[PDB]
Subunit: 259 residues, 4 copies
Amino acid sequence: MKYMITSKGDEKSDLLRLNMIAGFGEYDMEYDDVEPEIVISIGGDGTFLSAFHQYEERLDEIAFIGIHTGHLGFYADWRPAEADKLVKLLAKGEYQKVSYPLLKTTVKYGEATYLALNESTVKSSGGPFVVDVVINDIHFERFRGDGLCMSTPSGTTAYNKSLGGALMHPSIEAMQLTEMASINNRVYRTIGSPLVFPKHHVVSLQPVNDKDFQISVDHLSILHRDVQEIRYEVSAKKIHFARFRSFPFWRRVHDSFIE
Amino acid sequence: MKYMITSKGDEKSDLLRLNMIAGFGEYDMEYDDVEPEIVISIGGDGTFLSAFHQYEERLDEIAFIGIHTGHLGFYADWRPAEADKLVKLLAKGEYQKVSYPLLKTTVKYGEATYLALNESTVKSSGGPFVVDVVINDIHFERFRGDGLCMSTPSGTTAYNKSLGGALMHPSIEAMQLTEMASINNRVYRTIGSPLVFPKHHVVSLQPVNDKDFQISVDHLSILHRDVQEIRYEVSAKKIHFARFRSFPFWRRVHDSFIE
Amino acid sequence: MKYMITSKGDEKSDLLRLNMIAGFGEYDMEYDDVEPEIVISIGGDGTFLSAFHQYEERLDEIAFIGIHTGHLGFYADWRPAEADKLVKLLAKGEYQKVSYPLLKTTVKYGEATYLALNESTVKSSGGPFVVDVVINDIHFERFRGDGLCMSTPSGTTAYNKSLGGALMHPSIEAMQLTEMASINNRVYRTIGSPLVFPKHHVVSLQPVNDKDFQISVDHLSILHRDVQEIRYEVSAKKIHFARFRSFPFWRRVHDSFIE
Amino acid sequence: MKYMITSKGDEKSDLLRLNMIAGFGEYDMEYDDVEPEIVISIGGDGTFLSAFHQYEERLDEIAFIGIHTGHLGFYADWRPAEADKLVKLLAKGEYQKVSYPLLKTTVKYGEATYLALNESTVKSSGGPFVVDVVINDIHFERFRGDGLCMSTPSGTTAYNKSLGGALMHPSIEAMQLTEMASINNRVYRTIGSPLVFPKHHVVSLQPVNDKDFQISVDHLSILHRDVQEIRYEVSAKKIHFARFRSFPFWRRVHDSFIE
Ligand SMILES: CCn1c(C)nc2c(N)ncnc21
Ligand SMILES: CCn1c(C)nc2c(N)ncnc21
Ligand SMILES: CCn1c(C)nc2c(N)ncnc21
Ligand SMILES: CCn1c(C)nc2c(N)ncnc21
């Protein structure tokens, strides 16, 4: 089975990577980083994030796995001491696949599409940030503040959580919008609460004055110029995970934030 | 078609009720408050809440409608001037049915089940409130504060919203838990963020010291004694609405909070 | 020097109390719980709270001290192993006095005054809670929600903190009001932010419909009937602490919440 | 009396400015923008902000006034129709002076000091933002998030309010720190609550990895490189306002946010 392994780059991860390659070397397991079926990431959730974007083109052909050499990550939920258990279980299968929803981000000018595993945010380049929020072609509010954040279900535990958003189970195919330091007075008015949109709901951001935005998708962030509208909706593509055990989402939330 | 009409009790509502009964009196429309198929509520969302609980037994046999004689309610979303339009459209049908999820609340002692349209809350009778939160038979946290609130999707715009929870579209079959003034220090630790649970997820509250709780379901609130566990999960029953127009949920959110 | 010692009542505290009485028995130290000059509390901050209210009449004649037999309290900031150090330093003095502001609460009917070290809260007895907030005889807002909380500076780390309020240094003679789950829509409007009032500013709560309120002062909470107005203002009396060391307020905040 | 008038630059403001200059032209009132005693700003609070920074050198020699040609500002609290009332009352005096606290910001490298009327914020240039927060030379926390904000009392109604901070009366000589989207998990830990520091308390921010920060003071924001520490403390200088009427701070808060 075609596979590849990305590493965080430090001593702990590169050496654990060479051990698994030697472990797979005892099986009928071909290494390939062009068209792999199993993508293993070793490091942290940030390392897993780059592994997902490296192969965002053939998501349906890949099952992702993550080893955390630091603390317990949400996508990297395998201890290094369990790596040899992993190599043996990958050899044939009998494992199952688990799929999480994704977020499609479309940006039109005078058109680029992105796929986000965690979240996508919008901020203003330099000056004030004012956008008209449009939900299913109906004007909902005029936002003035620092920015907005649209999050995937599994991405709610990251930036979405720091902004007051709700943590939602990844079996729910939905997206969640949150606000950043919005102004609310007798002039400007925002909803304030986080909003959870289902499949087939389109959230569109339209500029009011300035047309340049600092848009981010996960940990890649590039300034866009002459933006006409930013379009958010739950993607039709899903990321596929290889499951060998029973690690519930709420147990991962408990271990990361409670204890 | 069997129907009944509840009124808020004031001058504006009782007179609008007698007009619709006379309007239905010109059609093949039988009045019945024992086994109606169409339940019309005139007043506010609180009046709609009592209309739902009056007939929570045969929810699948009923389609609810609401007229707001005050401000725009979320369940009562028909202007009084549109009442004659309503009477004519009820006469034959051609309308469609729209269903929202509900919340089942089970209370065991040393067992009562409830159905909630908005939310169900738990508080302590007098003294401190300490409960162990159990998600799918796994201990998640020990809550110490004022109380907890489990909300339906359509109920997120009410008490759930005042507690910082997210507003989620009612097409999502889910429930949302929020916290009330929880203590978080170097001793006690709660998640803080709101939690959104899908279907078939069971949230269970277990007492630590005191066993008496002030439990509420919508606007009915009764003290319970010798409680063993409180069990929350998305109900299998759904409330059915009669739709004649296109009033999206986000448009109702906009009119109630933005403008 | 006249002194008395209250204990939490458990094994750890009563035995530490008898040791200090024997320690003071070797000095010119008279025990008196009628008119003491040094009030020592052994247990937790709740034990200190009762010690303060036991002698709220002669606050200016007393210097309070607190030993924490559990975790680090904010008022009980002496380890039990440092009790013998305490007994020796109390013997003559050379210690200094540190004063914190207090909160006066006046309740008028058709008049009772209270002194609060932590906070004073207002809630509704059973039904909805609606009060008109009046600041310096000027109407500021109409609050509809669960309740309000007026906190002392040193009391900001308690209930005030759980409600989102700011932690303010106790050298600032001020009070802080916070809200509990307020309703904000296109009908009702509250400020939302916590408010910090200086000396000589009077905050007055006036009923709108119901006239019965569940009013609390620290950990004593009694239902009041036929209430005309609740009046909050920074008290002119101050609680006096005996200081022997340098334990800054921000260091106490750090040890309790950070580590 | 030496005076000058800045204008927002639009039609409404420049024409109201020329009327007041002609109004002062009938009195013994000399126009001077080098060393004025009365600085009049016409426009919004942002126009007042630039008027303050234009003359931040001789604050003790100046009394500021503000006319709002748009909506009710907090510093610009005079209606344009009351401009002729203003010109007459400035002619001799009989008015009184009202002083507000300020925020001193010191930035050391391998030293620049600033004066802020609203707030001063810190953010990271590009990458993650990690700073060690030091209060009175004692380490308090390690902050990881989007940034921090230190606000003046009168500046609490601006950016400080959007971040959840408390609105505090400007008669209190203090500063308030608030957090922006901080990460809190089983690894990183921040206090979360806003902190209110009195006079003579020094808050110091120290870098952990990156040493470049985007620092702002009111509406001027410049990237700093090779930063050793950022030092916040309540300034010894105060801004002086000319008062002719009784417009309480809480009445200004009410008119801006409630109604
Ligand atoms: C900042 C580290 N991190 C990343 C890269 N993804 C996540 C995530 N889903 N939840 C929590 N923390 C996360
Ligand atoms: C307090 C009035 N009210 C009721 C009874 N239900 C709701 C609701 N779903 N959303 C908003 N307000 C509501
Ligand atoms: C609930 C325990 N507790 C009491 C009784 N006072 C306090 C206080 N000022 N800060 C924190 N916790 C406190
Ligand atoms: C953004 C407009 N604005 C300025 C420039 N100062 C303030 C202030 N103190 N309170 C509210 N709004 C403000």
